[PDB]
């Protein structure tokens, strides 16, 4: 039994290799960042409202065309059989059995077909490669399979200082690879290339600034991840849970606005959509869960957090996710 | 002898059993909302004034008709018999004798009416129940019983999640039960219902919105508990200090406006008196002194904190409660 | 050899019984107002001035009609035989040698007369008692033996409750006597009957509210300190230094505006002068140095705090006490 | 191998005897100062820019007439032969095969005309002499020797209080000496004399308040360093980093604007550079890298900075400094 997504990270660290639960919880730098998610959230505290109707409480959203159980998707985190032998299959399953989106990542450890295969709600994060060729190659196979929306990562011109991982030496294990197959920095060119060429939602994954989110909207993209990589890119990036309530005033309506970053609870997606954001990704507690359990862990998370979710908005007076958005918050200390 | 009321918490723990201790002390989650009650007076600092006349200081408030002798009264807090034998008749036998109200309330371990014959100011603390008709029964056995207010608590359309407990596997012994006798989340209509039953001030527990505080005086309240249940509901609530300013200055005189949530000492009544409220509840340290002591041990804490509120309010300059409302504050650091 | 403050409380804390150092070095309550005192002023920091001529730095101020060597006098402490057996007379000697005024208190050890025959810039603190003609006696007397000012305690209509000492059990030693010899709380009424009896400037100890600061000058006040009573009375109560720069502000130049609590070097003289004090009083350092050294303690004392006021204003580009207190600051973290 | 800054600070602490690591790390006072600059720097998050264009990032900036390959010039540190046998000469001959300015100190451990004769962009670093003429002749010296930019000390009028050195009873060794040979405090005169006396920029090191930054623009000042001297001088001075904006602001372009303190990473160049300098001063990282490991050991510094430098940018969007000038940054806790 676990009754905490902590319950989980525990879990974890007895299991796996040192050096594989550091390149999971690791930073870039100092750490800052990282640490500066979980402070974020930490100090947002919501104003909660009494006596409404809670007869049909619902947690479902309407996201890129389609429903979703909870306003939550899995985010994209590589090579996933590092954590467990049946890495994204055992994820993707029980994020379909869960009602969650998944997304299927450029530099998965199965590939992308037979993840898609799985069904569910997959989508398809997108690294931009040196050959803009090739980039499109792998949205149109993306597309042809099945996945429902390509989310572009932007915050990668090039990896970050894991440091870490240089100490520890970290290298890929040979029995784990890149199963979808050289990349290079993305620009505004490139999402134009990307959104002429799918008819799928695009969605911009690491925007932090108020005018890249209105650029983005600009740019025809379908939604935003506010996002600084879970620390893992500029260490002393702000967190993206910090810009949000400011992105979600400057787009106005015009696109989704998801954020990602430290949701370790349903009170934290609480917190999130209260603070604006359609949706939210979670990453590092879906990959203690694979590896402490594998795809029964996954499941139990999912429903924990599925659980907590629907705790904190009854708790909160809100029958739907649209309510829990006209949450007002107050900051705090520590 | 016990000079603070955190000499009294360490007599608790020695005597109750662990699981009974965390059932008092916890919160939900993370407990988040729990520390921010502690956090947040902590922060406010009283501006004194010098050289007033204190030759009658008197700390008595006039409040639901009643003469009370501290701008306090007894929170509502289940199952005391959890924590002394002699369980709510031992408090409310303290309360009567140090002229404070003591809440009765809806899973009391001794029948309402036992409690009522005990004397003093009475308050009963209602939980609506899946019928309406049930529910209005119980108003009106409190009110048939003496009862001067109905406490009604309008933040728990289901308890929270008390992780001590889980982790504990918490259950009541077979040796307590609610001895006033199927719960529903209460809505507008509950309270109006309540209030068209009964002669009686309806007090609203657990407002933390300025809105929710209007439409309480709007709806015909003549009080509200600013609250977050102790951190036992929503974690990541606002603690209701925080917002217990805004709030006064909403309802503008239309009701009582009584705080909760971590008073600890005199100066922590001063503190509330000082943000605009009209009194406090106190609940853990009033079990504290009954798992110590029994009713002395709650005769010792009640006059204990008499002489810490005429203390820190001549040490400020007031000789009545209302020159304490009228104190300026100033925010600190830690 | 000392080079900071801090060396000499541990000296003293190696000396004295524990219950006396607790004495000494405690608050009220919870203690919070007595850490604030040093949080306060480490929050502030100093915006210095370069390139100014400094020729002739020098520390002296005109306070109340002398010339002091520096902008500091030792504050009223009780019972200094507490201390060391020279008591009151072994820092009356150290401050007249170092051109510093000296405050003898109501409760001194030694009489008035006595600590006034040493000599120097004596000022005496009055403690209001129960009868007016006694009252005015003790100023008559401080008056007659040659001190400057009358420095009015208005914090105390009676005193805090001291923690450290009900759990010690502490009481005055046998050895030590109030050498002057009921009291009772002053009001504004006590204030003029003492301003109309002297013609020695009255100055207001305790002072925290903006009002009560214009009321202190409109009723004929010399000057005030700014002061919790170094977190010894109300428990909760804001530091003096949070209120100065509003309360110099709102005097206009109408008194002299003193400020107290948690001066421990010569830096934070530099801050209160900058934040608009005319002056400061130091408490517990000068009863640390004492109890280490006698007399030739304090002396050490006050030389090593006239270097570092020197140092300070010197390395901020202050050739004298006005300019420091033109100089900005800027609120930090920690 | 070093993959941090603070990877070569444990190399020196092992390395040096205590009492010399203590001058190197000491501050003043409290070291209040010395603590702030980096809690400052910590409390600065940026908010990076995404898809520009990276193709040729360059890190490089024309200062005082001359391209640097960094936005960064080594700190003026005296008597650099505490820290490793061949003292100044190894740092500058590292900073010169790094394309980085290096700072001759006045107290200098090897002649100016020597570690000018390495090469590279010197600037020399002058300390007030009681003669007006003697002053005037070093400045002439560094100018003959092929110094570029005069850096005229203004915030030592005297030396801080070092409470290590003092502790230790610290003396410079009898192999150590001043090798460019009794000093005054600097006055906007003395400025005056320099600035008539040389072609040379001159650059005033050690400007906190915005007014002062000001007259240094009309003093004919080519730059200034906004400092408190890595908390060694008036403890409790404000960090640079707190005034730099404001000082950005109020010189509107008029001279270079450098910062120094605490900067520790590429990363807290990126920050320096977002708030509006125009390059940093690094001081004590470059003596742990002497003292660790001579000359290799500071070209593996600067090698590793450069690379944190290059990597912050291109994370954060900006293919030159003066794009990263024009970041905005959110202050954060802790
Ligand atoms: C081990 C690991 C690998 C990741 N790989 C990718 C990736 O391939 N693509 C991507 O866009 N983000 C990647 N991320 C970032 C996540 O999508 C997400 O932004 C970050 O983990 C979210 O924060 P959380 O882990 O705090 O929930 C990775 C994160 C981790 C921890
Ligand atoms: C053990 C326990 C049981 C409680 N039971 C009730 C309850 O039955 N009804 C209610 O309205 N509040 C209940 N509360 C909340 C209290 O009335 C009160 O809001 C909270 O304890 C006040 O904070 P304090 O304990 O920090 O003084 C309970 C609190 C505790 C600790
Ligand atoms: C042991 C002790 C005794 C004191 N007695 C008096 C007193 O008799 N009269 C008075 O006005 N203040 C008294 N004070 C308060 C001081 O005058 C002063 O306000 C406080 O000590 C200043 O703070 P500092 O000790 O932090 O420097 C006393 C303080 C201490 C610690
Ligand atoms: C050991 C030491 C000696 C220094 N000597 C000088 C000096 O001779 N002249 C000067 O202007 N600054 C001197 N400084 C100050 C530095 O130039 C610089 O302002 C401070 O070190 C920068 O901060 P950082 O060390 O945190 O990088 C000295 C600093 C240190 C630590
Ligand atoms: O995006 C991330 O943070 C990743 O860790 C992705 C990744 C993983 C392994 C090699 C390169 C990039
Ligand atoms: O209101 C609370 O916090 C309680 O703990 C009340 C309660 C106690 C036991 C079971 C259900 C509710
Ligand atoms: O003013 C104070 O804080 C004192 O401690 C004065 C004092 C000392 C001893 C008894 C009563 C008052
Ligand atoms: O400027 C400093 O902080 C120095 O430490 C310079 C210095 C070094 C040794 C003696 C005097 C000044």
């Given at each position: 039994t676990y009754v905490s997504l902590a319950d989980l990270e525990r879990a974890a660290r007895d299991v796996l290799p040192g050096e594989i639960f550091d390149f999971l919880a690791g930073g870039s730098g100092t750490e800052a960042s990282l640490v500066a998610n979980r402070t974020a959230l930490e100090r947002v505290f919501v104003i909660p409202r009494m006596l409404?109707?809670?007869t049909d409480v619902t947690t479902e959203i309407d996201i890129f065309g389609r429903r979703a159980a909870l306003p939550m998707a899995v985010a994209p985190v590589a090579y996933q059989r590092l954590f467990h032998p049946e890495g994204e299959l055992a994820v993707a399953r029980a994020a379909r059995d869960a009602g969650v989106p998944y997304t299927i990542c450029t530099?998965?450890?199965?590939?992308l077909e037979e993840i898609a295969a799985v069904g569910g709600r997959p989508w398809f994060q997108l690294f931009w490669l040196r050959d803009e060729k090739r980039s499109l190659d792998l949205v149109r196979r993306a597309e042809d399979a099945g996945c429902e929306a390509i989310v572009f990562?932007?915050?990668?011109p090039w990896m970050g200082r894991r440091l870490r991982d240089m100490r520890n030496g970290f290298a890929l294990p040979?029995?784990?690879?890149?199963?979808n197959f050289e990349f290079a920095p993305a620009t505004w060119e490139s999402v134009e290339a990307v959104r002429a060429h799918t008819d799928l939602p695009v969605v911009l994954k690491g925007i932090l600034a108020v005018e890249d989110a209105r650029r983005a909207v600009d740019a025809g993209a379908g939604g935003i991840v506010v996002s600084n990589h879970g620390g893992r890119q500029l260490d002393g990036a702000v967190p993206g849970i910090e810009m949000l309530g400011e992105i979600v005033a400057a787009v106005s309506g015009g696109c989704e606005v998801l954020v990602d970053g430290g949701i370790r609870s349903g009170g934290d997606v609480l917190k999130a959509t209260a603070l604006g954001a359609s949706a939210v990704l979670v990453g590092r507690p879906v990959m203690w869960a694979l590896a402490a359990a594998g795809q029964d862990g996954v499941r139990q998370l999912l429903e924990l957090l599925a659980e907590e979710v629907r705790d904190a908005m009854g708790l909160a007076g809100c029958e739907s996710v649209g309510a829990a958005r006209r949450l007002n918050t107050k900051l705090g200390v520590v």
């Open positions: 409404r109707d809670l530099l998965s450890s199965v590939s990562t932007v915050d990668v040979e029995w784990v690879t890149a199963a």
